[PDB]
Amino acid sequence: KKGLPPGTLVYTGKYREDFEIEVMNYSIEEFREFKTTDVESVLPFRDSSTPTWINITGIHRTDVVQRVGEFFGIHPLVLEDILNVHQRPKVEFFENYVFIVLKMFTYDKNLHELESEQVSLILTKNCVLMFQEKIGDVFDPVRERIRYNRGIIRKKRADYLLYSLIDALVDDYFVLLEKIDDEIDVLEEEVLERPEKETVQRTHQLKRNLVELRKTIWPLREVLSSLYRDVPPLIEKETVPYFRDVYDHTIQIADTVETFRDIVSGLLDVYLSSVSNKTNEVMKVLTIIATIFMPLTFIAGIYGMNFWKWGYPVVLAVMGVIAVIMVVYFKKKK
Amino acid sequence: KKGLPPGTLVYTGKYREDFEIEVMNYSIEEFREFKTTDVESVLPFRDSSTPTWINITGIHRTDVVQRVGEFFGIHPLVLEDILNVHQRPKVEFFENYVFIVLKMFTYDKNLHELESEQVSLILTKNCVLMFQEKIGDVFDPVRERIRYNRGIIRKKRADYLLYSLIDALVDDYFVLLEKIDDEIDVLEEEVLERPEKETVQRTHQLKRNLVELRKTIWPLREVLSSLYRDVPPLIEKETVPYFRDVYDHTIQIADTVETFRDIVSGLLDVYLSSVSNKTNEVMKVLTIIATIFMPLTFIAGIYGMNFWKWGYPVVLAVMGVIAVIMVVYFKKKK
Amino acid sequence: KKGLPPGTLVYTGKYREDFEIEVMNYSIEEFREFKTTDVESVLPFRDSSTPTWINITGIHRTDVVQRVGEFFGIHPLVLEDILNVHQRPKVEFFENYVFIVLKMFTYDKNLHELESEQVSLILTKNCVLMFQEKIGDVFDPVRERIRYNRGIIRKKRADYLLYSLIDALVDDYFVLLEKIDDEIDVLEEEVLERPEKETVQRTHQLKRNLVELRKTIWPLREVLSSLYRDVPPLIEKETVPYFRDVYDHTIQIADTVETFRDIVSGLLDVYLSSVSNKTNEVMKVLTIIATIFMPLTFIAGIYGMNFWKWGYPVVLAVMGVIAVIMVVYFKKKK
Amino acid sequence: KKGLPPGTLVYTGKYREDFEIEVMNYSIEEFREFKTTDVESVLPFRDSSTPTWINITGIHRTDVVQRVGEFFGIHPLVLEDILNVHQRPKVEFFENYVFIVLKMFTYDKNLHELESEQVSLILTKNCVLMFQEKIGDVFDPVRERIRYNRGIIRKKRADYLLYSLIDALVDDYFVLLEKIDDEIDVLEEEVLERPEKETVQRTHQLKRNLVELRKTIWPLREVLSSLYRDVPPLIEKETVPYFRDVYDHTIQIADTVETFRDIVSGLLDVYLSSVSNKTNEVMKVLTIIATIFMPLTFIAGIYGMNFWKWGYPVVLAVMGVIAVIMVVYFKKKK
Amino acid sequence: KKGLPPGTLVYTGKYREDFEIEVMNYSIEEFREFKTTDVESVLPFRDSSTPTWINITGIHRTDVVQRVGEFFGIHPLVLEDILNVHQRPKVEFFENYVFIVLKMFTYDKNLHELESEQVSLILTKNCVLMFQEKIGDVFDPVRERIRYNRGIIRKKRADYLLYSLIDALVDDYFVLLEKIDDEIDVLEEEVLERPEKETVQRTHQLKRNLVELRKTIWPLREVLSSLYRDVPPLIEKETVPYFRDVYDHTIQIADTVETFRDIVSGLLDVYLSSVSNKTNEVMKVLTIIATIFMPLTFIAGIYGMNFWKWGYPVVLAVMGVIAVIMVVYFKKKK
């Protein structure tokens, strides 16, 4: 089911398994990280001048979110939507904090199905609050840039770090689609030249799969559309243009998914075609052999009477000619 | 049946049974409630210092609705659109009172097709006038929060009471959709593997019911559209943020309804794919036992002539060989 | 067959039968009504202080229309579109008069097909000029309101009179949809279960009707759209609220029509399903009796050899075994 | 081919046979017309204060168009867009003249498909420069209005001359669609009751043609859209109101085209229905004579044994009873 | 493999074969060109007072591109999307340099499916920086115009040279469409009257290839829509109108691809009719020879009784009578 209260902290998902707090504070020269299971050890990062990313992996522990929320000054309505996993990826704007909800898919090969967790992000002063349902993600390459000063992540502010985690999750969508395209191509070829039972079963799954994505990606476009024109954390022409490379990344997917659904729309029709092509050929064999073997067992049936003479190389000779008379007629359709 | 007069008080619904006036007045410290059949006793509540929730259930009583409209100061054209329950969910903005028309869906499981009542809301000064068609609703959580002081409902003003009732009403659609989801997931799956008579029947009703739903949800989103950028009795940064967690809740439902229709649209094309191959499976059996058994019923037919000697293990030997030649020939289509 | 002149007065319609000029002049207290064929007797009303409604039934009298225009002050371009019955319902806001083109459908039960007369309206100073193609209209209740002092038609000015008629015309469309709904709600039931010759025909005609209805209601809503954010003669806070109830009524219709088209769209798809299964109903009986009786007409055909002895109950015993072997095999499809 | 040059005068049309220049100059009481092959005899009509309609029929003569453009001061890009006939119907607003591209369709009756020529219209000081590819245009009624001095064509200025032609060009489309309506009204009838081989050959040509028009009419509507809210040469109190009845006329066309395409849309699906029902009619016949005459040819097959005696009217009595038993079973599907 | 780094420089295509730098510098009377394998030699062109076209064919050399970037002050984020060939055709606007990404199509005739290379363009001061993947392009007519001094390419500025290359590209899409046109116009025919196995194969591929085009031309028009109401380097009344004939052309393309997509849309609905019809032709032959011959193989079967006397011409007379009855009965279906 769903929820019924007015605005309380309740988890909706199904990852009541893991709990970690992977914080990675870093400036221009120094960086420190630690993976703890205590909130009192990570809260003081609030008024820290050094850019800090606070990852909480295991949002089943409600009280922890409430503890982090009441301290940072997050309004009740927002903290709820962090735990409510069936929410529409959105962008909420307030006076002192920016709130963003995102999704992260993980697809299984061969067996068709995809399940996702809700990655919640919040930007305040110099902090990036991250929220996951389960352990393990696709933020590993972002961690790598922090750990060994790769690129320019160390040089930049906190909102860049946000935009670094966003671009990396959008990068995962690329890989996701890149994994889907290879899964369509050959399996879509086996629709025309290998049509049977589960061939349709696997198709309806893809439509559902594609709808699943487009309904999650469609608002992702407007997510970045509202963040391009207003810019509350400003620092304009360094973060904003970097954001276009992420917007070009999101608009890319938008039309890329419409490409798959557009093809799979007319893909189910192709099935009936290659099946109807074999409907007629099974109708052909059945008709020819009834067209010629039916009159000949009929002329043998009346000959099978037993209550004029002549015929063995007389009737069975015209029986051989009439058999050829019907074969020639059967090449005005082949 | 439809209307004809210029704009009088006529009830078009078919619930002329129940009638009970329920009023719930509360402040930050006190709480009072009662259930009566007299309208004169609920009138002085118009100019109350403390927020008041006036629930008038069973509006088939024409003059009773009129009595409230005359006292509170509600324009006659609106009082018509309350008794007329076939209206499109809309939001009217007046200088004094706020008017909202909403729907409440009661869905019957297994046996398909749905019926709905019209919940009309009016917000003036510090009162919320609620108009229902029949006894029994989904606003019990609101009642439960007033009665035992749960959440923050007591602390806030009169407009929050409106938004509290709206949150409970919108949360019903979640369950409504969640019930339709479980009435498709296990029924759509059985469309391909178990296709029969009532399989096409209940398929078309879903198509009807989804359209019935989307044409009521589509304006229901727009009900909140004007209820965002205008907001006359504002109290801004208290109701507006709470509103957004209902606007993102109404969009979620709206787009989830689109997820439903899109799958059901091309669902009937899948049905023909489940038949096409099961038409050809009946074709393969009908052609084989006519292409192997027609030439052998013909050879026995010509051997039935009774007007060369030799064969019993000579002719049946070749009739068996020719029968095997057809087995090899029927393995270029499997 | 259409028009080619620069812009004069040619009646393109098909009702070249009747001609009557009905006039209803009323105030807050007095009321008069008279019917005449003399055009000279109905023109003095142009400068009348009291509101008046002039019905010009049967516009096939080209010269009569020319007389009214040159007197009331009607630009020839506007006069032309009135006799041009193949017009897109529109609203012209000329500096001194309001011009509105409309449509009125009368439906035939059982035997489908629809036809319309173009009801044109003009508001200037204190008079409403009405135009019809034939005798008979849906404006009977309006007359009943003026004659018997019903509602608030006597008390108001001349623009309300215009909106009274428009309210009546829209209310006609409400019954039309219900009549069409009742010609689908019960006819749809026999589309799936009684599949015959004309069953396909009516689907096409309803699709034709709904399009011939769509492209008349789609602009009809936009007629009021421009008539919403403008109104030159105005009296806003006394007309705008009234008019709105009609704009909510037309937007109800606009959606209602799209509701029908949406159902009837994939209604023909259902028809092939009501055939594919019914083809396989017959495919069963045809295959059964040739799969069990074809080897048995073959084993008895080879026993038709006359040129082993043994059995009457020796072969008929295996004939009963081989027959049952095909009865067991035919329960992997049922 | 299309082209490789930057912006030169190249003719990609295929009507290199005719060459005539027709000029009509008038004021209000006088008018002159002459057909000449010289361009130096028509150039001095640029500085003519009285309205001049210069028509250049057969633009294949490259340099002939250039001489007009060089003298009247036409910019290179437009000059090419006169000879390049594939151009998308557009309207160009420049500093000293108004340019308009319009298509004229010639429809072939019975035998389908249609070809087209490009008409170019340039409006300068007091001239309307017309361009054509072949002798044959729907501008005759305009000529006849000038010749016998009909309507009000004389009284007005130059831009009215441009609008007159356009109004007479739009009227051709009313007839053009009228010729398509009938090509559907009569042929679409015999689609459901005359299923041949080349029936689909013509149906597909409507799906080619209805696209051919809507790609030309779509810009046409918008060609007037911009010609509504702009109008540089002004005299709007007689030109703009006249324009409106050409704009509604161009909307009437656009709306009717998409009325046709929607009926033709689900038309082909109707064809499969009339085939699937007639597949059942043949399925009904093919089963009976194999459901009754397959077991009866079998009982005579077991009586084909010749290696009990009893009856002739005893066996044929049970052969006749079993046969009528199957006649009763065949009344559970009809 | 897709991208994972932050915003560095990596080639993503497949053509890591060639490397050529081609520079064309000119003015009113002068012209220069050369092919160098050294990058340092094409650097001082940035500050040339004369317009220059710098082509860097073979971008895979990351260092070469990086060298040009840091020299021209091109921001890394833009430089990425140059080597990142898997992008959306977009237009960027900076104060000093203008950037444009445009796809270029190469099509193989008869044997379907196509391949593309990304052409990057950077305009700054008086230079146009082109970025091809492989040797061979569509910029030949331009090179012809620069050397021989054809047209007005010499007389205009640097931005015109960018526009001269753009029109040369938009023109190639006309050639691409023309090929695909005849790859459909004649191939569409031979699907109805020539139905085969691989015929459905290429039908689906052109469904995809239309998406590949339209989902690349759709934003290729937006490239010019943004490049219309902007004009940073301007040169106004010279380039502004020139652009429009490149905009009108790219509109034509968009209106041409949608045309195919609308015809090829329901092209497979025709194919099921090509089956459905010839299914029933085969159904007619299968029924007749079982409707005339089956009741006569039954009479001859019961006449094959061996356990009345009379006729050879008494039975074969009624055999002929019944055979005729079935012939007359088959004239209610032809």
Q: What is the CATH number of the domain that holds E113?
A: 3.30.460.20
Q: At what angle do helices E236-263 and D76-83 cross, to 10 degrees?
A: 20
CA distance B168 to A7: 12
Which among E245, E259, E333 is the nearest to D215, CB-wise?
Answer: E259
Residues of C in contact with D245 (CB under 8 A): 7, 77, 80-81
Q: Measured between alpha carbons, how far is residue A89 from residues A118, B248, E170 in Å?
A: 9, 9, 38
CB neighbour list of residue D325: distance below 8 Å, 6 or more residues apart: none
- D273's tokens: 């229905």
One domain for residues A1 and A142: yes
Interface test with C, best of B99, B271, B288, B326 (most C CBs within 10 A): B271
Question: B61-68: which pairs have CB atoms within 8 A and are 24 or more residues apart?
Answer: B61/B19, B62/B9, B62/B10, B62/B11, B63/B9, B64/B19, B64/B39, B65/B9, B65/B131, B66/B9, B67/B39, B67/B43, B68/B39, B68/B43, B68/B129
Looking at the DSSP bridge assignments, the partners of residue C127 are C52, C124
Looking at the DSSP bridge assignments, the partners of residue E106 are E115
In contact, D217 and D271? CB cutoff 8 Å: no
Residues of E in contact with D7 (CB under 8 A): 151, 242, 245
Amino acid residing at E253: I
Q: At what angle do helices B267-291 and B294-302 cross, to 10 degrees?
A: 20
Q: Measured between alpha carbons, how far is residue E197 from residues A281, E191, E271 in Å?
A: 12, 11, 12
In contact, D286 and E290? CB cutoff 8 Å: yes
In contact, B55 and B23? CB cutoff 8 Å: yes
Helix (H), strand (E) counts: chain D: 10, 7
Out of B265, B292, B321, a domain closes at B265
Interface test with E, best of A191, A276, A306 (most E CBs within 10 A): A276
Q: 């820290």: which residue's tokens?
A: A48
E264 half-sphere exposure, CB direction, 13 A CA radius: 25
| Closest to B299 measured CA to CA, from A288, E298, C305 | C305
What is chain E's length? 334
Amino acid residing at E223: V
CA distance E212 to D112: 32
Please indicate whether, in this complex, the C-beta atoms of C207 and D333 are within 8 angstroms of each other. no
| Closest to B174 measured CA to CA, from B104, B249, B279 | B249
User: What sign does the CA torsion over B307, B311, B312, B316 have?
Assistant: negative
DSSP state of D108: P
Q: How far apart, in Å, do the first and last CA atoms of chain C sit?
A: 60
Q: 């078009």: which residue's tokens?
A: B12
Please indicate whether, in this complex, the C-beta atoms of A3 and B171 are within 8 angstroms of each other. yes
CB neighbour list of residue E254: distance below 8 Å, 6 or more residues apart: E214, E217, E218, E221
CA distance E104 to E89: 10
Q: 């109708």: which residue's tokens?
A: A283
CA distance C103 to C215: 11
**CA-based Rg of chain A, rounded to a whole angstrom?**
33
Interface test with A, best of B253, B283, B288, B330 (most A CBs within 10 A): B283
Please indicate whether, in this complex, the C-beta atoms of C259 and B296 are within 8 angstroms of each other. no
In contact, C266 and B208? CB cutoff 8 Å: no
Amino acid residing at D7: G
One domain for residues E272 and E237: no
CB neighbour list of residue A29: distance below 8 Å, 6 or more residues apart: A154
One domain for residues E239 and E331: no
How much of chain C is in helix, strand and coil states, percent to nearest 5? 55, 15, 35
Beta-carbon neighbour count of residue B81 at 10 Å? 22
3-class secondary structure per residue, chain B:
CCCCCCCCCCCCCCCCCCCEEEEEEECCCCEEEEEECCCCCCCHHHHCCCCEEEEEECCCCHHHHHHHHHHHCCCHHHHHHHHCCCCCCCEEECCCEEEEEEEEEEECCCCCCEEEEEEEEEEECCEEEEEECCCCCCCHHHHHHHHCCCCCCCCCCCHHHHHHHHHHHHHHHHHHHHHHHCCCHHHHHHHHHCCCHHHHHHHHHHHHHHHHHHHHHHHHHHHHHHHHHCCCCCCHHHHHHHHHHHHHHHHHHHHHHHHHHHHHHCHHHHHHHHHHHHHHHHHHHHHHHHHCCHHHHHHHHHCCCCCCCCCCCCHHHHHHHHHHHHHHHCCCCC
DSSP state of C29: S
The CATH number of residue E201's host domain is: 1.20.58.340
Give the full edge-to-edge strand order of the sheet including C20-26: C31-36, C20-26, C52-57, C127-131, C120-124, C97-101, C91-93
Residues of D in contact with C283 (CB under 8 A): 283
One domain for residues A223 and A319: no
Which among B241, B274, B290 is the nearest to A75, CB-wise?
Answer: B241
Beta-carbon neighbour count of residue E307 at 10 Å? 11
Judged by DSSP in three states, C310 sits in: coil
Residues of A in contact with B286 (CB under 8 A): 286
Given resolution (angstroms): 3.9
The Cα of A92 is separated from the nearest Cα of chain E by a number of Å equal to 26
Residues of C in contact with B290 (CB under 8 A): 290, 294
In contact, B232 and B93? CB cutoff 8 Å: yes
Q: Measured between alpha carbons, how far is residue A251 from residues A244, C293, E119, E309 in Å?
A: 10, 65, 20, 90
Residues of D in contact with E274 (CB under 8 A): 200
- E332's tokens: 């209610």
Q: 């030169």: which residue's tokens?
A: D8
Interface test with B, best of C181, C298, C305, C332 (most B CBs within 10 A): C298
User: What sign does the CA torsion over D310, D311, D315, D321 have?
Assistant: negative
- E strand segments, chain D: 20-26, 31-36, 52-57, 91-93, 98-107, 114-124, 127-132
| Closest to E153 measured CA to CA, from E174, E137, E168, E138 | E168
Task: Give the total number of structural domains in chain C.
Answer: 3
In contact, C293 and D295? CB cutoff 8 Å: yes
CA distance C321 to B273: 36
One domain for residues E138 and E182: no
One domain for residues E76 and E118: yes
Q: Measured between alpha carbons, how far is residue B190 from residues A321, B183, B270, B274 in Å?
A: 54, 11, 12, 11
- The DSSP string of D146-160 is HHTT-TTTTTS-HHH
| Closest to C133 measured CA to CA, from C147, C156, C148, C116 | C116
CA distance A320 to C176: 70
Interface test with E, best of A152, A255, A281, A303 (most E CBs within 10 A): A255
Question: D281-285: which pairs have CB atoms within 8 A and are 24 or more residues apart?
Answer: D281/E333, D282/E280, D282/E283, D282/E284, D282/E287, D283/C279, D283/C282, D283/C283, D283/C286, D283/E283, D284/C282, D284/D333, D284/D334, D285/E287, D285/E291
- B47's tokens: 């100019």
CA distance E222 to E214: 12
| Closest to A15 measured CA to CA, from A61, A63, A55 | A61
Rounded to 10 degrees, the C-alpha dihedral D305/D311/D316/D319 comes to -60
Residues of E in contact with D87 (CB under 8 A): 248, 252
One domain for residues B19 and B41: yes
- B206's tokens: 């879903």
Q: Measured between alpha carbons, how far is residue B105 from residues A144, B150, B171, B217 in Å?
A: 52, 26, 12, 11
User: What sign does the CA torsion over C84, C90, C95, C98 have?
Assistant: positive
Judged by DSSP in three states, C20 sits in: strand
CA distance B215 to B88: 9
Please indicate whether, in this complex, the C-beta atoms of E255 and D279 are within 8 angstroms of each other. no
One domain for residues C136 and C159: no
Which chains sit next to A, with 3 or more Cβ pairs under 8 A? B, E
CA closest to A315 among chain B residues? B302
| Closest to D162 measured CA to CA, from D68, D28, D40, D55 | D55
- E249's tokens: 């052309």
CA closest to C265 among chain D residues? D266
Rounded to 10 degrees, the C-alpha dihedral E334/C273/C264/D334 comes to 60
Out of B127, B147, B167, a domain closes at B147
The Cα of A278 is separated from the nearest Cα of chain B by a number of Å equal to 8
Please indicate whether, in this complex, the C-beta atoms of E275 and A277 are within 8 angstroms of each other. yes
In contact, A98 and A129? CB cutoff 8 Å: no
3-class secondary structure per residue, chain E:
CCCCCCCCCCCCCCCCCCCEEEEEEECCCCEEEEEECCCHHHCHHHHCCCCEEEEEECCCCHHHHHHHHHHHCCCHHHHHHHHCCCCCCCEEECCCEEEEEEEEEEECCCCCCEEEEEEEEEEECCEEEEECCCCCCCCHHHHHHHHCCCCCCCCCCHHHHHHHHHHHHHHHHHHHHHHHHHHHHCCCHHHHCCCCHHHHHHHHHHHHHHHHHHHHHHHHHHHHHHCCCCCCCCCHHHHHHHHHHHHHHHHHHHHHHHHHHHHCCCCHHHHHHHHHHHHHHHHHHHHHHHHCCHHHHHHHHHCCCCCCCCCCCCHHHHHHHHHHHHHHHCCCCC
CA distance C38 to C42: 8
CA distance C114 to C172: 14
What is chain C's length? 334
Residues of C in contact with D283 (CB under 8 A): 279, 282-283, 286
Q: Measured between alpha carbons, how far is residue A113 from residues A106, A253, B52, D304 in Å?
A: 9, 20, 50, 62
Q: How far apart, in Å, do the first and last CA atoms of chain A sit?
A: 60
CA closest to C308 among chain B residues? B312
Residues of D in contact with E301 (CB under 8 A): 296-297, 300-301, 304
Out of B265, B286, B315, a domain closes at B265
One domain for residues E134 and E155: no
Looking at the DSSP bridge assignments, the partners of residue E115 are E106
Looking at the DSSP bridge assignments, the partners of residue E98 are E93, E123
Angle at alpha carbon of residue D271, lines to D265 and D273, rounded to 5°:
115
Residues of A in contact with B256 (CB under 8 A): 215
One domain for residues A315 and A284: yes
CA distance A97 to C143: 64
Q: Measured between alpha carbons, how far is residue D39 from residues D17, D20, D43 in Å?
A: 18, 10, 6
CB neighbour list of residue A276: distance below 8 Å, 6 or more residues apart: B276, E272, E275, E276, E279
One domain for residues A1 and A138: yes
Please indicate whether, in this complex, the C-beta atoms of D290 and E290 are within 8 angstroms of each other. yes
Which among A263, A272, A301 is the nearest to E300, CB-wise?
Answer: A301
Residue E330's Cβ-count burial label (10 Å; 0-12, 13-18, 19+) is middle
- E185's tokens: 């116009």
Judged by DSSP in three states, D53 sits in: strand
One domain for residues D4 and D56: yes
- The DSSP string of C104-125 is EEEE-SSS--EEEE--EEEEET
CB neighbour list of residue A195: distance below 8 Å, 6 or more residues apart: A271, A274, A275, A278, B277
- Strand (E) or helix (H) holding C302: none
Question: Which domain does B206 fall in, by range?
Answer: 148-265
CB neighbour list of residue C44: distance below 8 Å, 6 or more residues apart: none
CB neighbour list of residue D309: distance below 8 Å, 6 or more residues apart: E307
| Closest to B122 measured CA to CA, from B162, B64, B81, B66 | B162
| Closest to E93 measured CA to CA, from E207, E199, E232, E236 | E232
